[PDB]
Design a protein around this nucleic acid. Structure first.
Length: 54
RNA sequence: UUUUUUUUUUUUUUUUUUUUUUUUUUCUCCUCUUUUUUUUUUUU
């Protein structure tokens, strides 16, 4: 599944690939997806130093 | 000489029922005068 802002495909797939703001969007609410999460992996950790998105 | 990112129109449907017009009041109440009562009869 792809949860990018301008393309939404198969939002119920086993594996979801999304931008970072989507993760906090589904973490503010319950969304009943956290119960079945085994691995969550980050691809670019060097944005902790980002001046506007860190 | 001005880049990068910020999801979207609630889920559900394959439940049983053996009655019958109406419907419920109003009180006792001084009748004036020629009479017995005439009468057959025939022409429809």
């Amino acid at each position: 599944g792809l949860l990018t802002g301008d393309v939404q495909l198969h939002p119920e797939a086993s594996c979801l690939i999304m931008t970072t703001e989507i993760l906090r969007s589904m973490l503010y609410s319950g969304s009943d997806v956290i119960r079945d999460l085994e691995w969550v992996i980050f691809d670019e950790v060097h944005y902790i130093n980002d001046v506007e998105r860190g």
